[PDB]
């Protein structure tokens, strides 16, 4: 059924699974019109589809052209997400197709289920975790490829960079969610933390800085302090 803290280690067993997050698929800026009314202008979006075991990210860029002439965009976006995930599964060889797909928002369940009727043996599951994948557009290189796209485009990343050479998937996911949780609660500080020491660079083929094990512990600690703080600043405690 649903995914939560109890069955948390299932993510890192050897059944292929993908998380799908749709929070950045349909993105708008809201503005005033000359007549003083309010209008939206859409900006490019993305589907965040992640294998938590391998780190492979399947970043489907949603170009604003997909919305032209369409009504009820927030609802269409869930169905467009489902179509794109279904197309992605169909393009994978059978031994790469997921056995489960976990949607981060329950509203995706029916759209994906209907788009995946051809795959009765793929379980579509919700989760009770409050996962921070919406902050993915706070990773500069991801935001960059999304804003620059001029057509629909699928871009593949390893969101773990090379971490799996030194740590387990479980620990890799934990770091990732800690970084994203920090970026989500206070983007400015989270980013100040990640780039303070200009001698730690981001490799051209990576998303995050090249920290040593010891430098990651410090970083990780700094992110937890930020997250606790912002929880204080926000509740006064």
């Amino acid at each position: 059924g649903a995914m939560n803290s109890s069955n948390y280690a299932e993510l890192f067993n050897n059944d292929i699974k993908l998380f799908v997050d749709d929070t950045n698929v349909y993105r708008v800026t809201v503005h005033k019109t000359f007549e003083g009314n309010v209008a939206t202008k859409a900006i490019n979006g993305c589907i965040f589809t992640l294998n938590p075991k391998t780190g492979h990210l399947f970043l489907k860029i949603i170009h604003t052209s997909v919305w032209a002439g369409q009504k009820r965009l927030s609802q269409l976006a869930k169905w467009k997400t489902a179509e794109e995930v279904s197309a992605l599964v169909r393009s994978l060889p059978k031994e790469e197709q997921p056995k489960q797909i976990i949607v981060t928002r329950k509203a995706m369940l029916d759209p994906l289920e209907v788009h995946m009727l051809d795959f009765p043996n793929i379980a579509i599951r919700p989760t009770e975790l409050r996962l921070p994948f919406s902050a993915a557009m706070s990773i500069d290189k991801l935001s960059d490829v999304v804003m620059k796209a001029t057509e629909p485009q699928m871009v593949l990343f390893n969101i773990y960079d090379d971490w799996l050479d030194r740590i387990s998937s479980y620990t890799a996911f934990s770091r990732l969610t800690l970084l994203l949780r920090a970026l989500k609660t206070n983007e400015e500080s989270a980013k100040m933390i990640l780039l303070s020491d200009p001698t730690i660079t981001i490799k051209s083929y990576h998303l995050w800085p090249s920290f040593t094990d010891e430098q990651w512990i410090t970083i990780e600690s700094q992110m937890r302090d930020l997250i606790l703080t912002e929880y204080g600043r926000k509740y006064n405690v």
């Binding site: 489902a82 289920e113 209907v114 009727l117």
Partner: protein, 300 residues
């Protein structure tokens, strides 16, 4: 006006005949029901005084034969069975009518309730939902499961209703996923009406029969089937104008006739609020919506 003669009433039982019912005491001198209006299907049903578990009963049309009820003390129920010798169904009945040991199907002449509940119900279609072909009549009880329920165990004792499933390939055209799931007109009109049921009368007939099985036997899978068939129409943006009007009438008499105390189990909150307030047809069920609001505003 036709007759269903009972051999005898050896056990205390509440007998129903369509929407009527009456108590028969253990070994009361009861020998059947007379004045049954020809031209309709009928249902005769039973709830034992000793075991309110298992309401059961028989769908029949009097024109299809002479039928009578005799208690079987081995199997422990009142069985319907056909009398082929017609000079027996007359002689036996006349003797029991002469001795006035038969209750009178008590139709009020202003009353069209049964006709309105059974308008599209036809025995030939009942006998394909209830598979047992050596009998001109059809047995149903509280516990019988539906073909679709068994998918999600004995097939011979199943209600073979038409399987409806909104998240199925039958219901969803490749490439119209969103269109067809939010507007089921395709599924209703092409797949079900034109394809499976052939016309709206067969559709309405199954709908009506499922409701009556839900109401008279508390058959849970029938109630699912009745709500599913309602929900498919309500969730279709495009429905023939005549189906909508007739649907509003069908539902009105079903809701009118329902026991006011059985609403909690037989009425599915989600389907009704959707049909009446959210669906495409929110504005098309005036009579049904008025009786629902004035009789069960709690549900909504």
């Amino acid at each position: 006006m036709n007759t269903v003669p009972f051999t005898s009433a050896p056990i205390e039982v509440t007998i129903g005949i369509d929407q009527y019912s009456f108590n028969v005491k253990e070994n009361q001198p009861f020998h059947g029901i007379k004045d049954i209006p020809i031209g309709h299907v009928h249902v005769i049903h039973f709830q034992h005084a000793d075991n309110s578990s298992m309401r059961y009963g028989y769908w029949f049309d009097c024109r299809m034969g002479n039928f009578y009820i005799q208690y079987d003390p081995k199997d422990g129920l009142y069985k319907m069975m056909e009398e082929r010798d017609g000079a027996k169904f007359e002689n036996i009945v006349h003797n029991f009518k002469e001795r006035q040991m038969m209750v009178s199907y008590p139709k009020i002449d202003e009353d069209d309730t049964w006709y309105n509940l059974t308008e599209f119900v036809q025995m030939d279609k009942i006998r394909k939902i209830v598979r047992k072909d050596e009998n001109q009549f059809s047995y149903v009880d509280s516990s019988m499961t539906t073909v679709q329920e068994n998918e999600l165990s004995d097939p011979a004792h199943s209600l073979n209703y038409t399987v409806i499933n909104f998240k199925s390939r039958e219901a969803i055209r490749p490439g119209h996923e969103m269109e067809d799931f939010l507007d089921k007109s395709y599924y209703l009109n092409t797949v079900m009406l034109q394809g499976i049921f052939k016309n709206s009368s067969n559709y309405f007939g199954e709908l009506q029969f499922a409701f009556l099985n839900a109401m008279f036997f508390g058959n849970y899978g029938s109630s699912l089937q009745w709500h599913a068939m309602i929900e498919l129409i309500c969730s279709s943006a495009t429905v023939p104008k005549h189906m909508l009007d007739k649907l509003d009438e069908i539902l009105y008499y079903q809701i009118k006739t329902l026991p006011e105390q059985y609403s909690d189990i037989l009425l599915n909150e989600r389907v009704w609020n959707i049909c009446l307030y959210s669906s495409f047809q929110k504005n098309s069920l005036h009579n049904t919506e008025k009786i629902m609001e004035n009789k069960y505003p709690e549900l909504l």
